[model samples]
Target: KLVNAEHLDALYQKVTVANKTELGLIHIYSEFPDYRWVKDPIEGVSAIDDVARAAIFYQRQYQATGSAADLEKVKSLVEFILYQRADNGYFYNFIYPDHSINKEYKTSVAEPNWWTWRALWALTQVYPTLVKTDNALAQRTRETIFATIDVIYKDFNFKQTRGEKEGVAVPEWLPHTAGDQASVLLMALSDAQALEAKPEIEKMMRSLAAGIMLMQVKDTSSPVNGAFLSWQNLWHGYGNSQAYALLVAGNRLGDRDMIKAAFNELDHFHPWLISNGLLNEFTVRQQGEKVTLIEQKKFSQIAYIIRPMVFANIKAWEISRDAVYLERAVDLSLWFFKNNPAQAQMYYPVTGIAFDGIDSATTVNKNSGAESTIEALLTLQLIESIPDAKRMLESALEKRNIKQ
Candidate 1:
């Protein structure tokens, strides 16, 4: 008899709409399991970044399964972001219970560079998927994405360092010179290049992408280095530079050697990844006595795991002629889905991790929500298309035969 998979599948679809909660313009909802299990009950809208990610996932589901509800969900999520927009861009977050955007008067929180990047990332992911169904949404989303990039670059002071100095105007959480943020910039630019208004944005995209591409892999000196290093909080970035930045930049620049180096480092660090599909936020190192591995925390954990593993695999399969790379990609995703089923909801840059003293099962403060699930779902959808993805991954013994 065929497995009675209907119950779980139905629940998954139901929760897509039922789990919603609103905080001012932002939406909050039980990611997968429940919000009662969150590390902080007050951390409402934990998966704000997932809004765009969830939209992308739902759009894909609509395409494959022809579910109108999924399409409706995508519309709702996009409207929520549009409603939250301020003069320049969307406000970062909102205070729950009160239902107000967290502004200076309310919570000292302000517009975040990464927050806009997150929105751009989601729009970029979903625009192509939605273009056929709703051309207007696709065009508008693409425009907003480019506009968000312009806003981000305008506010970014390349010379000044990044960090949350209490009196300073900088955003908290992400360091000034973080490399992960650079990855977002490169991705947004690439998306800009892929838009209908391609000609006008081409120079802008090239300037931003090339400028970011030139940055040292992990250094935060000039715009290129500054862009790369801004997201590199040493605790997580390791003494070396961030591999994702290099991978993304190399992919953007068509630099084969740089991409190879990034892929190789990812391969080397696979063993350090805790199971349940979470990427530890701590930078892995083998250097000396002071080689103390910092504890992992909730810093872009979801993106690290989902994006590199899935995109790398997809790129390897589609662009690069490496079947082995595709196998590695599928394996990492399977581990996440099997070990941490709750995370299969969105594609934001964070997920849970045990790199810190926290229990492996304990999800991070605000990372493993919608964005991760969308990314995971996309990876799985691709897996369904390619049979070898799952089989070859199952054949590997942890970090054994897998290539970067």
Candidate 2:
């Protein structure tokens, strides 16, 4: 029942003295055939988004297994995150082949954006344990977290603005009015608040939760009802961790509305997507109360999309103890095991290489990137740690009799 980390362990590399930081980093991509590390033409060779995600994976794995190796991996990954901290305490995402930080690239720029939020998430997630095992490391993470959160206080807008995108209504208070991005911050803040009891972190979590709540579709008549649009009139299946984040924040904050909102999406919209064969994303149009689905794409499904769905569903089971939730989660997770539209297994358990995506019903992108690999590992690791969920996955996979 151990989650395979073979390929990923190979990707976790040491700095060669040519690097700016000595902390080990996960290479950003590994191509097919040779599976050599691949660099981004725009971004770089390594990215904090993937590294932070790796930290999340190892952090949880360490807790479950209490393995010295997993703990070391978690510490090294988090150290890399800390090393990337900008003067403003925000984060830069990428690093070059020479091991120098990519400080000026578009996605790599140090700012309160996707990479920053995820980095904060990893640090906070590992802080409690680091305090017990590595006091100095914990203190540094604590300082960096407080430092970065200040930037959010001064810059993040909590305007409570609601506007229509073309015809569909959406909330404008989220980081650049994107609920997908806000959820990432919410996860970080939820952990931060729980660790230190900071009112500011709770306030940020509430503001974010409120904005995400405003984004959900409440019309039962609509097929997309209960779906929280990721951004302007659109719901992207990937990176929309809305329900999972809300449940975490809601339970910690004792906010029932947030809890119910999370349930609304899981109970209604999730089933709709599952029945519809799982879309990559969709656009919507609304007039008054009736919301219409404008457009949707079903192809090019990826692990990034499935991981969040599995997380949300499993989280529900954890809190509600409903077998249905765990069953649904296992069902959703079969995307990696060959239940997808392609009937193609996206992840290879023998090597822990999760293909970048399923490009179409007949084909898949063979490249195994850092994001895809770690995302798959996180999902697999989560289910394996939960006895019931693990059994559910085993039963489902046996039913499929898949090979990938």
Candidate 3:
């Protein structure tokens, strides 16, 4: 039903980090190391978000085991984030070997939105701890994070002013809007507040959290779903960050009302998980006093979506100490394995690389990319962080009616 944690860790270690090459700079390649770049398509050549995510992966590993090598990787990644930032302090998501911004790539759409958020997340992850231990790295990390925080607030406030003048409201949609933008900002702001509480930072955090709460689904009758409807007003699996942002900001700010709202949304999340086939896209229809749930099977499942959903559940468990949330997170983790009804394995066991996604044809894309690999690796880290994670995996496997 699932690859045991021990095996997963070994598989993760097998993927070597690449040194600087003719293809690009020193990075964890989009493909598994030693796997030719031509066979696997390259987007942005060496994606910054991927590097950042992989840096977090190494950070997690360093936390688990005080490996000097892992710590070095984190340092390298932090340096990469600082170097990649643009003049405005926000980061460019994609770049070519010649160091040109990726403007025309189809897959690298939504430049500097999710990428900037992820960069913020990765950079902040090293702070406080790294600050005390590595003075120089920590200072650079703080400066970059503070700069980016300023950039995000200025952009958001600027848009607010323009919206007022144009008689238009800021929309809570993906790529750069409500859920994705707010969640990362909330997290980074929380980290920044920990080091040095700035009134302006708290102001931005509250503003962003308020936006997230406003966008959250309010129809309590819809038991099968509750989340910030994103993009096309569909409860996307990725948009669970809307709820995540609330819980984070609530806990940090001591806002009981915000915390309660997050709990309520999470309470409605379980039914949605089961009804939507473990976080797939679905739409609810009402016809003559009858309700129908339609599973949009044409859409393929991707790790990018499930990774955030899994984190939302894990964060719920952390906040509530509810075993049920942990259980759901475990189930979501197992969903990617080959034993699942999807009958496809996103992670290649031999190479420890996760394919971009499983296609609607129930076949996998067969190419291991950075986003998917980092996501799958992070999912493992989250699960393993819990107590007796192997037992949890065993319980999940038994429920799936299988064994290793």
Candidate 4:
């Protein structure tokens, strides 16, 4: 199996403190070696970002295998996410090691943003099944999600309002007018179906997808063409799931435009990035519609960057039934397998630790963090889900002949 959840599973910390233990939460964080300096316990040990991502991995596993163990993991994860919600319906992103809510840190604040979006995504994935399995929790999740998305909708419903950045027209209605953040919001809306707010949800998904598309560099002559800038003329590797998320939204909403746009990125931009040995980020200059690639930094490469590329390619292959897309996924995934400039493996099967980012051509960050492990596992898990993809991954690995 390509996926190893050993380290990720080990990170799950069951609530034991008297103050917040009543919530029965099992959070994950407080990095294995206790890294993150000021953010360690100060900003709270665990946050919803990795929690929701883990839930997403479990939910996919449950759907694929229907394993009782996976189901419980998903249940536990969804519960923690639900428990993390504020009285205002928005979610608190972080919690102390004791499972108490974190409200001071900017990222941890209970407001509509990344944490809330990821929380909604995880909750919605299991909502339909929870109808029979855990009706009360399911119903509560339903209400919570409904409350959350509508608030987002009322504020961000497909505004024709356009904001220009260096000659590029950007849709400003999305959270931070961000392609990256909107991608996660789109992922959340992909599985969500609303009885009361069906129209609102649809509008939200459609508009959000459109905004992301608007952020793409479409001219073929340009270096970054077919690339969706993560935010305002910049593209970052992490959370660059814009293409994959759009394909999902298109599939769910029956929009071919979204699918086509996604295909372009997967076909052109993604393979191009992988061919170049990967990158952490790049900023572009927009002149006459085609954005010029201003600068790119390949150092500081993290596992988070790879997951999105792998996911985008896997998704492209899944929706299109094309082997080339899967091949690209394997190519993109080579980063984890020592096909990098560092000539080192980031994830280890023995210890099951996906080390933190590659800092330079000769230096690996060695420290294992929550995000690194979870992101790498999510990629591996998705690769393991498809037999054809699994076969491809196996063949790719065998060809390397680098097994220890």
In lDDT terms, which candidate is top? 2
- Show the colliding residue pairs in model 2: none
For 184-298, candidate 3 gives per-residue lDDT tens digits of: 7677787777777888888877777666665455565655435554433345665356666677778788988788777776678664665556555655543333334444443
lDDT of 4 by residue, 1-404 (tens): 55767777767655645554333232343343653322464677678888888888777877887888877887777878888888777889888865567886897988778888888887887787677688877888888878887777766655568988777787878788889999988988877754343877887788888889988888889766798888887889898889889888888878999999998888888768877888889988887856777789998999889888888888888777889988888776778889887988888766667878888999988777678888888888888777888888888888774542
- Kindly indicate the candidate among 1 and 2 with the higher lDDT: 2
lDDT of 2 by residue, 169-287 (tens): 66777887889889989988888887778777787888999989888988889998999889988899999999999999988999999999999999999998888789998988888
Superior candidate under lDDT, 1 versus 4: 4
> For every candidate structure, what is the RMSD over all alpha carbons to the true structure, in angstroms?
8.7, 1.5, 5.4, 2.6
lDDT of 2 at 236: 94
Which regions in candidate 4 have their CA more than 4 angstroms from the true location? Answer: 16-39, 194-197, 401-404
Please give the distance, in angstroms, between residue 257's alpha carbon in candidate 2 and its true position after superposition: 0.2
- TM-score winner, 1 or 3: 3
Cα deviation at 197, candidate 1, in Å, is 6.8
Model 1, span 1-404: residue lDDT tens: 01111211221321222246422122333333443223224544333454545566566667667877767667666655544456756455433433444454322244665555556666776677667778877677766776776666566444433332211123232323444564565565666555644444444434443333332233222111211222232334321233554555466656676576555544444423433244335432222212233344543344335545565555556555777667667656654433343343222212221111112444433333333334445555556556676555445425442222
Off by over 4 Å in 3: 1-35, 38-43, 99-112, 158-175, 282-298, 339-341, 348-350, 398-404
- Tell me the TM-score of each prediction against the true structure: 0.62, 0.97, 0.80, 0.92
Shift of residue 81 alpha carbon in model 3, Å: 0.7
Each prediction's Cα lDDT score?
0.46, 0.86, 0.62, 0.79
Model 1 alpha-carbon drift over 4 Å, by segment = 1-47, 95-99, 104-110, 156-175, 196-253, 271-279, 283-307, 337-379, 391-404
lDDT, candidate 2, equals: 0.86
Q: For model 4, which pairs clash?
A: none
